[PDB]
Amino acid sequence: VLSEGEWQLVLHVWAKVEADVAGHGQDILIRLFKSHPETLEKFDRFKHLKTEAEMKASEDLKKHGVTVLTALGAILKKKGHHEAELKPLAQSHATKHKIPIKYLEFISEAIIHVLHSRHPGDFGADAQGAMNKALELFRKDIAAKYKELGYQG
Ligand code: HEM
């Protein structure tokens, strides 16, 4: 359970992401894909991208980054009352896209990285800890729905 203080740190930094959702979305997906190449293989859409330059030139990758961050933003702004928003996301990522929970850990790390790079004055250690807790809560609750469906492993 995050506290109200910790939610405020999280959503203070997130409001700054909302000024440039596409740029953030691109940097995070590129970092995920470079740090953890296995994750790119889950996207038939992107698996032709062999260089960081080709990834940064891809409009379709930048489109997907906005889709991911708008959905994450929607869940963060529920401050933990996010069951309606997580159900479909867990359902599709377990059963259709086949994404292990650990790759959700990876993209959490890439999101923390990108926010520290772009918003260092709003993303000190308090706010880093709080964002980590929010992202853990997202992963806990998706993992519980994986388990229900037979995909926690
Ligand atoms: C913050 C974590 C994430 C969020 C909020 C998220 C959000 C989304 C949304 C909103 C969609 C499209 C709607 C849907 O299919 O449910 C999507 C599609 C997809 N996601 Fe995620 N995603 C996350 C993490 C990941 C990770 C870690 C992977 C892969 C490693 C991944 C792989 C996919 C794939 C393969 C699609 C289908 C893309 C396509 O071919 O159109 N997701 N995601």
Swiss-Prot record:
UniProt: O2 binding residues:
64
Can you state the subunit structure given in the record? Monomeric.
Which superkingdom, per the lineage?
Eukaryota
The identity of this protein, by name, is Myoglobin
Globin domain sequence ranges: 1-147
One cellular-component annotation, GO:
sarcoplasm
Q: Which reaction does it catalyse?
A: Fe(III)-heme b-[protein] + nitric oxide + H2O = Fe(II)-heme b-[protein] + nitrite + 2 H(+); H2O2 + AH2 = A + 2 H2O
Q: Which residues carry this modification: Phosphothreonine?
A: 67
Tell me, which GO biological process terms does this entry list?
removal of superoxide radicals
In which compartments does the protein localize?
Answer: Cytoplasm, Sarcoplasm
Q: Name one GO molecular function term.
A: oxygen binding
What EC number(s) does this enzyme carry?
Answer: 1.7.-.-, 1.11.1.-
Q: What does this protein do?
A: Monomeric heme protein which primary function is to store oxygen and facilitate its diffusion within muscle tissues. Reversibly binds oxygen through a pentacoordinated heme iron and enables its timely and efficient release as needed during periods of heightened demand. Depending on the oxidative conditions of tissues and cells, and in addition to its ability to bind oxygen, it also has a nitrite reductase activity whereby it regulates the production of bioactive nitric oxide.
Identify the InterPro entries for this entry. Globin (IPR000971), Globin-like_sf (IPR009050), Myoglobin (IPR002335)
Q: Disulfide bonds, which pairs?
A: none
> Into which family does the record put it?
Belongs to the globin family.
Is the keyword DNA damage assigned to this protein? no
Keywords assigned by UniProt? Cytoplasm, Heme, Iron, Metal-binding, Muscle protein, Oxidoreductase, Oxygen transport, Phosphoprotein, Transport
Broad EC category: oxidoreductase
Provide the binding site for nitrite.
Answer: 64
In the record, Phosphoserine modifications are located at 3
Signal sequence region: none
Give the residues the record marks as binding heme b: 93
